[PDB]
Every structure is written in structure tokens, then in C-alpha cells.
Amino acid sequence: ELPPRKVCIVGAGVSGLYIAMILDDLKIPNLTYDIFESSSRTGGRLYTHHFTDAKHDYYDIGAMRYPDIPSMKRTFNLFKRTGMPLIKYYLDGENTPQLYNNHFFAKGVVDPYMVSVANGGTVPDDVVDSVGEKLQQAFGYYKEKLAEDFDKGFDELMLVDDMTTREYLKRGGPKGEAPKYDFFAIQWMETQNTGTNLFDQAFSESVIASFDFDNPTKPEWYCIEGGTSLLVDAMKETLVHKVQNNKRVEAISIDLDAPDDGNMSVKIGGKDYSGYSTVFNTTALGCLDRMDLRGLNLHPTQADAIRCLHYANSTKVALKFSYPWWIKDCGITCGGAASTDLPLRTCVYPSYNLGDTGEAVLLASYTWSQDATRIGSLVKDAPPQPPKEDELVELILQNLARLHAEHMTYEKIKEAYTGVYHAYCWANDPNVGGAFALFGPGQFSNLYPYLMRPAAGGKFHIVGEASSVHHAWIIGSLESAYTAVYQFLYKYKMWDYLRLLLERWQYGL
Amino acid sequence: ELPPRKVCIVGAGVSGLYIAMILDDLKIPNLTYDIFESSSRTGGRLYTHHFTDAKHDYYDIGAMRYPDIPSMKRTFNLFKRTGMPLIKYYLDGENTPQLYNNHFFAKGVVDPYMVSVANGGTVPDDVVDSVGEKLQQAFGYYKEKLAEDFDKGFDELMLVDDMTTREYLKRGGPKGEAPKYDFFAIQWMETQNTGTNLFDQAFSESVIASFDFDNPTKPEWYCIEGGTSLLVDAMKETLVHKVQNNKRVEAISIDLDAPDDGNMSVKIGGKDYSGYSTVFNTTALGCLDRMDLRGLNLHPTQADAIRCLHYANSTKVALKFSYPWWIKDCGITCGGAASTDLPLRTCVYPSYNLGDTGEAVLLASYTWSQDATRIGSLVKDAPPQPPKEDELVELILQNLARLHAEHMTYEKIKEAYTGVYHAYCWANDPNVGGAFALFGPGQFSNLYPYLMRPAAGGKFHIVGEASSVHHAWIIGSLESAYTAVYQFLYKYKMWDYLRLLLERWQYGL
Numbered sequence A, B: 001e002l003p004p005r006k007v008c009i010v011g012a013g014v015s016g017l018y019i020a021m022i023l024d025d026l027k028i029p030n031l032t033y034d035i036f037e038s039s040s041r042t043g044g045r046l047y048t049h050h051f052t053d054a055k056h057d058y059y060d061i062g063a064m065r066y067p068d069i070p071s072m073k074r075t076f077n078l079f080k081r082t083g084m085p086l087i088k089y090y091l092d093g094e095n096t097p098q099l100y101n102n103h104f105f106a107k108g109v110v111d112p113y114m115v116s117v118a119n120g121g122t123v124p125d126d127v128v129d130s131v132g133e134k135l136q137q138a139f140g141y142y143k144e145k146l147a148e149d150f151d152k153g154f155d156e157l158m159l160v161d162d163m164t165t166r167e168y169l170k171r172g173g174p175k176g177e178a179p180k181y182d183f184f185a186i187q188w189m190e191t192q193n194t195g196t197n198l199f200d201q202a203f204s205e206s207v208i209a210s211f212d213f214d215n216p217t218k219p220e221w222y223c224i225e226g227g228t229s230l231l232v233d234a235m236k237e238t239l240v241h242k243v244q245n246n247k248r249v250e251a252i253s254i255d256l257d258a259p260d261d262g263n264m265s266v267k268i269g270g271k272d273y274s275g276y277s278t279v280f281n282t283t284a285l286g287c288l289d290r291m292d293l294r295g296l297n298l299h300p301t302q303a304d305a306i307r308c309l310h311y312a313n314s315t316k317v318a319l320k321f322s323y324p325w326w327i328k329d330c331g332i333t334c335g336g337a338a339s340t341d342l343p344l345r346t347c348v349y350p351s352y353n354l355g356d357t358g359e360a361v362l363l364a365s366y367t368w369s370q371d372a373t374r375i376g377s378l379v380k381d382a383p384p385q386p387p388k389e390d391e392l393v394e395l396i397l398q399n400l401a402r403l404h405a406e407h408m409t410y411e412k413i414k415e416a417y418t419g420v421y422h423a424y425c426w427a428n429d430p431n432v433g434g435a436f437a438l439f440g441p442g443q444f445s446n447l448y449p450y451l452m453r454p455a456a457g458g459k460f461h462i463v464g465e466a467s468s469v470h471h472a473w474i475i476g477s478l479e480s481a482y483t484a485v486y487q488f489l490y491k492y493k494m495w496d497y498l499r500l501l502l503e504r505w506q507y508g509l
């Protein structure tokens, strides 16, 4: 018979909720848990904003789209477990505009943006129209290895993890046998492939992001109709022990002189909470670094990983319009997205309101990295009516006009704007401190192993999307939580329940 | 006589104020200007926060310290010209603690922080105690060349500008004849030299920053007694045409189908302001990228520079204490700064209140890059009292207690805290979008020439610290503003006043 044990789950995001769901499912005798959530809200970076309760009057501030690829199977099993209403998401739509250097894209014209050297720009002629082909040549070997077996593909990719994307492109790979590209060719590839400056981060991350967004299997994509927050509601409902919101952990400790299993504690608001056999920290690493972790005696390089593993910013801006003018007036009837070098960078047409004829939401700006930091600096809490008086609104409307200048005027977009919008910059969220992990050069191969290293005698686990090989996806959160529960059961020699974990949760539900 | 001409200065920071002061000094007949400032406040990144009107009850949110090195002569000339009350600033002080891996620094001790391989860390034994010496070996050649002639030293430095600092350290320089360092040695060097992740930006910037802070001439440092904003006040008082605050330029344009000199215009809140013969934009580049610049027909790589040139974040947190416990209880009597791997990173002891025995300000946290983004996520406008409930206040007090554990307790520091503090995160300022330019690899040698390329027939100038080789210093702003005025006078062949510019303003005041 198992002695009474209590574990602590720090953070009620999808990873912390997944840990509780797994523990609830295994039904281990005399085992309990507490879930402390710093925010008054539960879900973390699963966060649907509802403008009203109307059916499609929302947008997802955090996670929103899911590729049906084999490496994401655990995410889709969680969708099945909780009965999520999945519908098709259109990564690529029809008639979506692309606007660079104030020129619209056109198929089969050489250098439509007028950025090539032959047209007075600095992009080499043989690169300007061949970005996808040359990034495929740079990423494609590793992408196919990842498609056969993600873990073994990752281990081979780690042999070049010391390089940034720019570095790999500049030197022609690790030994100069790949093509070498000058600064402006690499710069154009970054402009056409990702957010500003992100090619100065890890090459391995550019490969994995390309694996996820441009997967060799050419997958179907999905969204959750009604918002991703429906997943949080369903996970919360099943909890045996409910989330305790407004409980921000500021310190974590283990008492190595105590003989007991439950010799760990966390401090919340100056008060001590002890008796825990294991602590799962599921917060973003910036939040973990603010805690007093001295009582845990972390390996010095593990502490370095908490502080230094790189995070990228992301900002989203969603506007409500009286009718879907992008559908009706521009023929953008199947989702997709418009991309531009204008400040909004990416305008995402929702896949969930394509049949609606009245009020409709447009995810008017979705940015990463410096683009998101620049948009996020306009994201305040008490903006002013009218639109022109709000700098962010006016910027978005002007960028939308230029981006859709083939069919709309600024005047008619402005008149369709209801005056209702919402924006969010994840780096300004004190409960995250960033959007998601996006490691720099050498971090996966050098710092990440020490982040995942056993701490406090195998009783402390750093959990979350950053503690995964799938950054910035729900799947990384779920894998990290599953792995941590494995280690917990292994640590306490609960062989019956570890075997049950592998039987029920390795491939599924 | 000269025909009447009008120029427009976008931005009332030190760049735009310097332009107006130069034009005021040259007294060019029938030449006028308008200065438009987006903010209700004038000064930009010269920004003193005054807790009260008491003599020393302030801290500088932006610029605060100035090294008396030859490359900084134009800044001190500006100080001299405006009668600034300069006092000595102590970059290094007495008894300043250094805290890494929860260990304090101790001279003459091997690996006092317990981070080397010999003590269970990952920092190479030959690196852990030699960061200053190995970085000097990596930067010193170029630092000495910059000391002889900054411009010629910069041009030689550009021959390795394709490399990041980490890349230069990893590969042993451009051809592998310098020492090669593994990831953890480079990581420790970054931890001990700059802010988190900044070794993943340009090697040239790490060299220039080392040249500024650790100059071979080993210079005296100075600050402005009463706050740097006294410089803004003095420059404002001299202006012939006063700053127009709350005037945010959203578009800049030139009418090439108009024969007049004054064929340029700017839009402010929908209304046009035309008749300008030249426009000086002095704003940060993120601010410029949000403007509609189509009417200027910028070179596409110049527009890329505006979007992509990298900015670093920075955040400051200052706390008021009933008495300077760092002076009286810790022997920290001569300014300096305490450095740590804790969230606050750097605690600066002011040099302007060393004789005070009552209320004193402490610049408790001064951070850059990801450190500043994480601290800045706690910077809100209406936080709660008491300190325990403001997460930022509590974090700072806790970090301060650990940093000064050799002489203070958390309880004594907390009781000395008045409850009055201020914080500021420059990336959250919509009038800047960042702290200052910190270019990535290859950006100085590739993007920066196009940023500085003549535009709109020589009538548009991108001015400011980012538009110089001295990023994040007043000197960069002054040099850029001086160079733009030169090119304006050259463009209109005002040879008499160009000669007067060189006579009075080249090494002038």
C-alpha cells in the first residue's frame, strides 16, 4: 500500500493541466496534488479572446492552429480525449496578397518586388525568386530525417546546432560544401521566411519551424471552433483537485536533512506550502528565474539555461468589421494569410467565419521578434476612440489599406471597422515574459541538456514547451509534461503505474 | 539674398535639438525650421525622473554617464556650451559586491563562483578566472586601432563585421589563428561582460562597447548634477523656433513634380505640413518604419535597414530609501556598480548623492536585452501598495538582499525602503520602440551604408544614434545631426555657411 504523497504543479497552462489529467487518469492511491496559478486566469498561452458571446466573435491570443503531422499526434489525442470541435484551418488560402517594397506579388514574373540587383536592389538575381527552393536545399536534408523519426533527426541536426541560420547560409554549411550566400541573399530569405532578425538565432530552430510549417507530408491543418480556450475549459472540468488561481510561487525548496518523501516546499505571498514529494514547474523560464531557487541547489549550467535560453516576442492585433470585406470584396474566401514588409507583417484571415456575412473578426497583425516588440510598444490598456486617435488602430488600418489596395480603399476599410479591436504582446505579460522559446546558436546542444537534468535528487522538474524539442507548440508542452510524469514514477519506483503510464499515455490518451 | 527656406525636424530628442542649435548658431538668412515632437515631453532618451524637487532626488531613465575620451569630445563641447554642472561619475567604486551562482567574488581565489569544470560546472578552468584578459585578447587589437583614429579603426573592424561575438570566439577569429572557445567559455564571457544573448549580435558592437566602457586611455567619467534633463532644458531655452509637442509625424513625402526647393511635406494627424526644402528625421528607426514613406521612394535596402537594424531593450528600476544603507552599512561610498546573475543584473550606486545622509535614490536594477524584457514585463503604471504585493518591488528587494547579504538583511533593506520607486522599459515606449541600436552580424557593413544613403534627391536625412558609428551614446546622436546639417548645406551649395559649419562645429561648441 502506497504511503500518502502530495505533489505540487506550478502553473495552470496546458502542461500543468496535462500533468494533472495524467495523474487523475492513473488514479494512484493516496497521491494528491496542488496546482498553483499566478494569474486569475487559467490556461496560460492557451487564451481565446471573446469580443462577445456570439458564435465566431473571437480570436486566439495564443495557440490557434494545429498541423496533422505524426509528431503532433499527442496534441490531437488530447483533442479527441476532450471532445474538441475541430474544423479545417487553411494555412494557405486563395487570393491572399503579398506586398514587399510597395509591390504586389505576381506569379511567374521575375523579381515582382523590384529588389534584385538587376532592378537596382541588392538581392542577388539568382536568389530573389528562389527563396523557397534555396531554403529547401538548406533545410531539406534535416527535414526529411525529422520526417522519418523526429528524435533521431533531431540528434543528427544537433551536429550543426552551433550555427545560426545566417551562419549556415553564409559559410555553405559546416564545411563549406553547401552554397554560400552574401548578406543580402540571406537577408531576403529571412524577410520572405520568418520574422525580423530570427535568422540570427539557431539554424536548428529554423529547420524545425520549417519542418512544422512546411512539412514533407503536406498535412491538413486544424483549429478549434469556438477558440482554443475550449480545451482549457474541458481540461479544467475533469480536475480532481481544482486550480488555485492568484497563487504566484516565488520560491521552491527541498529539505535534504528531512528523511521524508514530502520534504519540498514552495512559498506563495510570503507563506510556506510544504509536504511535497515532487514539484513540477511548468512556467515560462523567465518566471522561473525570478523565483528563489537556492533551496534546490541547481547545477550552475542548469541555472544558466533558465536565464539565457532565448525567447522570442509575439504580438497579435484583432479587429472587428461589420462584414468580412476580405471575403466579399477581395475574393479571400478560404482563410490563408497575407504577408508584407509593412509593420503588421502578417494578416491572417480566420478559417472559422468563412460562411458569416455580418460582423467578422480579422487577425490583422501577427508578428514575431523585433516586429512584435515594435507593434507591442503601441499595445496599451486604455486606448482612445476614435480610430485615428489610437496610433495602433490607425497603423493597422493604413497597413491593411496598402496591403489590400488591389480591391479596397483606406476609406472603405475604415468605414467597415466597427471600432472594436484587441491586441496583446506576450513579452508584456508578467506571467510569461515572452511568446515562446526560440533558442540561439548552440543552446539546444549545450544548455538544453542541463535544463532537463535531474534536480533536487530527482524531485524537481522544469516543464513546458521550452523543456521540449518542439518549441512554441502545444505538443512540446505535452511531451515535456509526459516525460516529467515518467521521471516522477520512475523516481518513486511506482513500477505498476509507470507501466500503466506507457500503456495509456505513450501513444495516446 | 538667399531665398526663404523651411526645413522640418522630426523629433525633439538631442539629435533634433542639436540640429536646431546648429542652425540657430549659423543664422542663415531667411532659413526657418519646425520641430515636431510626438510626445508631450521633449528630450527623447534624455530623461531624468524627479521623485521630488529635492536636490538629489532623481535618477536618469536614459543617458546618465559620459566617458572623457577623445571620441566623445563633441558631447563635452555640448556640455560646455550649455553650462552643464558636471561632476565625477564613478564607474568603479569601493566594496561593490559581485554575486554569481550564489557565491560572492573574492580576489586571488580560483573559481570563486564554483562554475568551472574543476568544481562541477561547465566553464573551462582556464577561462573562468580570465574573462577580462581573454576578451581583451579578442577586442584589444581593434580597441587600440579605434584609440588612434576611430574612423580608420572602424573601417578595419568592418573586415570582420560578418561575425557575431560568439562566432568570433568559437572560430578563433576570421581565419582560426586566434584562440577557439567552447560554448560554455563563450557563455561565461557573455555573462561576465554584457547582457544575456548579446554575444549573439555583432562582434563589432562588442568591440566598440568595450572601447567605450574600458577605454585604453582609462578615462575619467562624468555625470550631470541635477539630471541629464538639465541639458534638454538648456537646449530648449536657446531655440529660435520652439518645439511643437504632441505632433506625431505619420507620413513624409516629396513632390518631384514641383520645381520649388520646398517640395517636401509631412502628415500629422491627417493634416499636411508642406513647403519644406529638407526633412531631418531624428526618431528611432522603429518609429520611422511606422510612417508612410512611399512619397520618398527610398532604396529598398535602405527601407530594409529601417525595419531590420537590431535594437536592444533596456529597463531601469530606481528605489528611494530613507538613508543610503549601501554607503553607511556596506562601505559602498564611491559609486560603482554591483553585478549579479540574479534578475536585477546590475545595481548602480549613484555618484551624485555620496554626501547625503537622509533620503537617497538607488538605481537598483539596470538591465539590457532579454534581462530588460523580463524585468520590463513587471513594469506597469498603477502597481499596488504594499511592496510585498508589487511583484517588481518585491523582486528587487529580494535580489538586493541577496546581493548585499555580506552586510544587510532583507528586513533591514525593506524597512529602509520608503515605498517610492519608479521603473521604465524603453521597448514599451511607443516613441522609441527600444533602448538603442545594437546591430546584428553584418549589419554595420551591409545595411548601415544604405541607411545612410542619400534619399529624395539629397533632401531627406535619417538622423540619430542609430545613424552613427557610436550607438547608444549622445555622441552618436550629435555626430549624425552634424553630418546631416553638412549634407543639407552641401546640397544647397551654401558654401559660406558650410565653411562656417566646419569652422565652428567640427571641433566646436
Ligand SMILES: Cc1cc2nc3c(=O)[nH]c(=O)nc-3n(C[C@H](O)[C@H](O)[C@H](O)COP(=O)(O)OP(=O)(O)OC[C@H]3O[C@@H](n4cnc5c(N)ncnc54)[C@H](O)[C@@H]3O)c2cc1C
Binding pocket: A010, A011, A012, A013, A014, A015, A016, A036, A037, A038, A039, A042, A043, A044, A045, A046, A061, A062, A063, A064, A065, A066, A247, A248, A249, A250, A282, A283, A284, A287, A288, A314, A315, A426, A431, A432, A434, A435, A436, A463, A464, A465, A466, A471, A472, A473, A474, A475, A476, A477
Ligand atoms: C502567440 C503564440 C501563438 C501560438 N500558436 C500556437 C499554435 O498555433 N499551435 C500550437 O500548437 N502552439 C502554439 N503556441 C504555443 C502554445 O500556446 C504553448 O506552447 C503552450 O500553450 C504553453 O504551455 P505551457 O504550460 O508550457 O506554458 P504556459 O501556457 O505559459 O503555462 C505556464 C503557466 O504558469 C503560470 N505561472 C507563471 N509564473 C507563475 C508563478 N510564479 N507561480 C504560478 N504560476 C505561474 C502562467 O500564468 C501560466 O498559466 C503559440 C504560442 C504563442 C505565444
Ligand SMILES: Cc1cc2nc3c(=O)[nH]c(=O)nc-3n(C[C@H](O)[C@H](O)[C@H](O)COP(=O)(O)OP(=O)(O)OC[C@H]3O[C@@H](n4cnc5c(N)ncnc54)[C@H](O)[C@@H]3O)c2cc1C
Binding pocket: B010, B011, B012, B013, B014, B015, B016, B036, B037, B038, B039, B041, B042, B043, B044, B045, B046, B061, B062, B063, B064, B065, B066, B247, B248, B249, B250, B282, B283, B284, B287, B314, B315, B426, B431, B432, B434, B435, B436, B463, B464, B465, B466, B471, B472, B473, B474, B475, B476, B477
Ligand atoms: C537606457 C539608456 C541609457 C543610456 N545611457 C547613456 C549614457 O550613459 N551616455 C550616453 O552618452 N548615452 C546614453 N544613452 C544614449 C542616448 O540617450 C541616446 O543615444 C540619445 O539620447 C538619442 O537621441 P536621438 O535624438 O538620436 O533619439 P531620441 O532621444 O529617441 O529622439 C527622437 C525623438 O523623436 C520623437 N519621435 C518619435 N516618433 C516621432 C514621430 N512620429 N513624430 C515626431 N517625433 C517623433 C521621440 O519621442 C523622441 O523625442 C542611453 C540610452 C538609453 C536607452
Ligand SMILES: N[C@@H](Cc1ccccc1)C(=O)O
Binding pocket: A065, A209, A212, A368, A436, A471, A472, A473
Ligand atoms: N506554433 C506557433 C508559434 C511559432 C512561431 C514561429 C515558429 C514556430 C512556431 C505558430 O503557429 O505561429
Ligand SMILES: N[C@@H](Cc1ccccc1)C(=O)O
Binding pocket: B065, B208, B209, B210, B212, B213, B471, B472, B473
Ligand atoms: N551608453 C549606455 C549603453 C551602451 C553600452 C555599451 C556600449 C554602448 C552603449 C550605457 O551607459 O550603458
